[PDB]
Amino acid sequence: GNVDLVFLFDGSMSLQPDEFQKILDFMKDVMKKLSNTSYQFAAVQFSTSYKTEFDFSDYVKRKDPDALLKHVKHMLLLTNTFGAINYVATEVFREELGARPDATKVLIIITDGEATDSGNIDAAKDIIRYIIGIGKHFQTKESQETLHKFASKPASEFVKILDTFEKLKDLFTELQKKIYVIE
Amino acid sequence: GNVDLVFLFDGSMSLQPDEFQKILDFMKDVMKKLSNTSYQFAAVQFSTSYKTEFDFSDYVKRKDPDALLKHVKHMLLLTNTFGAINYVATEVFREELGARPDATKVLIIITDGEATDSGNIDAAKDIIRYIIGIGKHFQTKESQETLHKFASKPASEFVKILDTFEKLKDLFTELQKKIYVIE
Ligand SMILES: [Cl-]
Ligand SMILES: [Cl-]
Ligand SMILES: [Mg+2]
Ligand SMILES: [Mg+2]
């Protein structure tokens, strides 16, 4: 059926210009591949606070991915992941913002560091949540587990750990192998 | 998993140059949208006889549909669909020709007239068969009924009827709404 997918990307102080660009490229690639499908998209940059770069209505109005993200500016601040996730659940997934009523909700969280805040993401528990942890900040198994709480279960399918930002290209390659025209 | 898909397109005398071109456009549109996935394609033109325009190996070596179908010459003869389907079953789905051993076999038959031969397609029965009947030759319930024996069950799912070749543009729009990234 319909799929309303939200990209919640890390814009923290740790990211180098090229790394931030690779995150933007990844989001665009998936969007272009899935253009003219039953998917609709929204994008929110998060660091200390949260900013919807374009919401569902924006995408519907102008499907152009490159145009939708041409205005993004790297925040360069903290990594308040609990707040960011709750922000999507209540401020982005809204009918008035273009979200479709009984559409399946999906969240693709991309981050390069552990969350600097805490609390709960209970309000977002019914959204299908994928998280992509990139870079040396996720070298240890300990740091990787910290991401499970944000993603759906099992972690084996929903939590993806990438050692480099270059690997985002590999991940896109792999996701395309999972694309099918369903009966 | 892996999907080996063969397009079997009508090259009969009834087809005008632009109608035959729209059939090719449909095939290329499909292939382009499904590029870099688990799908691999082969295309066979049929009329009085049959011709593999490019096989699975060719597709793999040069994944460019436009380049893959640039030499196609409209046969302009009859409509031997029974023989054509049997040819795909035994002359196209072959490992030496690029087909992957246990990939799901799918056949997309595109035609604008009733078969001019007879027999059976028992040898192609394990292949998921879709048939697209286009135009004035299918304006009666009887003519449309004859297409059923070539496709998988139920006909309501595997038989597609288009009043015009223009409609192949519509059909492609429709099928894209069924494109999802599987878990
Ligand atoms: Cl950081
Ligand atoms: Cl004909
Ligand atoms: Mg960071
Ligand atoms: Mg014909």
Which residues in chain B have their CB less than 8 angstroms from residue A36's CB? 173, 176-177
- Is the torsion defined by CA of A48, A24, B33, A172 positive or negative? negative
* Gap from CA of B128 to ligand 4 centroid (Å): 23
Residue B111 Cα, gap to closest chain A Cα (Å): 21
Beta partners for residue A42, in sequence order:
A6
Which residues in chain A have their CB less than 8 angstroms from residue B173's CB? 36
User: Which residue type sits at A118?
Assistant: S
Burial group, residue B128, by CB count within 10 angstroms (0-12, 13-18, 19+) = middle
Residue A115 Cα, gap to closest chain B Cα (Å): 26
Q: Does B122 touch chain A (CB under 8 A)?
A: no
**Between chains, do A179 and B182 touch, taking CB under 8 Å as contact?**
yes
3-state secondary structure of B105: strand
Q: Which of A164, A171, A144, A139 is nearest to A155 (CA)?
A: A144
Which ligand is closest to the CA of A113, given by its number?
Answer: 3
Q: Name the token pair of A81.
A: 């992941």
Question: Which one of B178, B179, B182 would you mutate to disrupt binding with A, by most A Cβ within 10 Å of its Cβ?
Answer: B179
**Between chains, do A180 and B36 touch, taking CB under 8 Å as contact?**
no
Locate the chain B residue with the closest alpha carbon to A170.
B36
Q: Name the token pair of A22.
A: 């690779």
Q: Give the integer Cα–Cα distance in Å for A32 and A94.
A: 23
**Between chains, do A3 and B182 touch, taking CB under 8 Å as contact?**
no
Degrees (nearest 5) of the Cα angle B148, B153, B155? 45
Q: Does B71 touch chain A (CB under 8 A)?
A: no
**Between chains, do B182 and A180 touch, taking CB under 8 Å as contact?**
yes
Residue B126 Cα, gap to closest chain A Cα (Å): 16
* Gap from CA of B137 to ligand 2 centroid (Å): 9
Locate the chain B residue with the closest alpha carbon to A156.
B183
**Mind listing the domains of chain B with CATH numbers?**
1-183 (3.40.50.410)
Residue among A36, A176, A183 whose CB faces B37 most closely? A176
Per DSSP, the residues of B144-171 read HHTTGGGSPSPHHHHEEEESSSTHHHHH
In contact, A7 and A44? CB cutoff 8 Å: yes
Q: Give the integer Cα–Cα distance in Å for B15 and A181.
A: 28
Q: What is the DSSP letter of B134?
A: E
Q: Which of B123, B137, B128 is nearest to B19 (CA)?
A: B137
* Gap from CA of A67 to ligand 3 centroid (Å): 25
User: Which residue type sits at A96?
Assistant: E
Write the Ramachandran bin of B36: left for phi over 0, alpha for psi from -120 to 50, otherwise beta: left
Residue A158 Cα, gap to closest chain B Cα (Å): 9
Locate the chain B residue with the closest alpha carbon to A2.
B177
User: Which residue type sits at A113?
Assistant: G
3-state secondary structure of B141: helix
Q: Walk across the sheet containing A104-111 and list its strands.
A: A50-54, A39-46, A3-10, A104-111, A128-134, A159-162
Degrees (nearest 5) of the Cα angle A66, A69, A71? 120
Residue A77 Cα, gap to closest chain B Cα (Å): 32
User: Which residue type sits at B87?
Assistant: Y
Instruction: Count CB pairs under 8 A between chains A and B.
Output: 51
Per DSSP, the residues of B69-94 read TTT-----B---HHHHHHHIIIIIS-
* Gap from CA of B76 to ligand 4 centroid (Å): 9
Q: Which of A161, A45, A38, A41 is nearest to B173 (CA)?
A: A38
Q: Name the token pair of B25.
A: 């456009």
